[PDB]
Structures are given as structure tokens and as C-alpha cells.
């Protein structure tokens, strides 16, 4: 898929945080193109 975050600044800023917390390389690029993966990240930030 394409980089959704590239179009949504919020999605980019959000993934950036989880990328560090989750401590998983590629996570940022994964959640950016993964609606399901965002669910988990949404819980952590919550």
C-alpha cells in the first residue's frame, strides 16, 4: 500500500511515537499502511 501518513500529518506524528514505544523497526511504515496495526497503537497512546 501507499504511505497514508504522507497524506495525513496526524497519522505520521502518531506512528512516530508508537514507533519508539513499541520499539519495532519498520513499525512506523507498517502502521502507516496497516489499519489493523493502528488499533493496537491506539490503545497504547490511550
Curated annotation (Swiss-Prot):
- Source organism superkingdom: Eukaryota
Localization: Secreted
Comment on protein domains: Is exclusively composed of 4 tightly packed alpha helices (no beta strand is present).
> Which spans are transmembrane here?
none
* Function recorded in the entry: Gating-modifier toxin that inhibits voltage-gated sodium channel with a preference for hNav1.7/SCN9A (IC(50)=25.4 nM) over hNav1.1/SCN1A (IC(50)=4.1 uM), hNav1.2/SCN2A (IC(50)=813 nM), and hNav1.6/SCN8A (IC(50)=15.2 uM). Is an effective analgesic in rodent pain models, since it is several-fold more effective than morphine in a rodent model of formalin-induced pain and is equipotent with morphine in its ability to reduce thermal and acid-induced pain.
Species name? Scolopendra mutilans
Q: Give the misc comment.
A: Negative results: does not show effects on sodium channels hNav1.3/SCN3A, hNav1.4/SCN4A, hNav1.5/SCN5A, hNav1.8/SCN10A and potassium channel hKv11.1/KCNH2. The synthetic peptide has been found to be inactive against Nav1.7/SCN9A at concentrations up to 1 uM, in contrast to the isolated natural peptide described in PubMed:24082113. Intraperitoneal injection of this toxin has no effect on blood pressure, heart rate, or motor function (as judged by a swim test) at doses up to 1-10 umol/kg. Arose via modification of ancestral neuropeptide hormones (ion transport peptide/crustacean hyperglycemic hormones (ITP/CHH)).
Question: Which tissues is it found in, per the record?
Answer: Expressed by the venom gland.
Q: What family name appears in the similarity comment? A: Belongs to the scoloptoxin-03 family.
- Any S-S bridges, and between which cysteines? 5-32, 15-31, 18-41
Entry protein name: Mu-scoloptoxin(03)-Ssm2a
Amino acid at each position: 500500500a501507499d504511505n497514508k501518513c504522507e497524506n495525513s500529518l496526524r497519522r505520521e506524528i502518531a506512528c512516530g511515537q508508537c514507533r519508539d514505544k513499541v520499539k519495532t523497526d519498520g513499525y512506523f511504515y507498517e502502521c502507516c499502511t496497516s489499519d489493523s496495526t493502528f488499533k493496537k497503537c491506539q490503545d497504547l497512546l490511550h
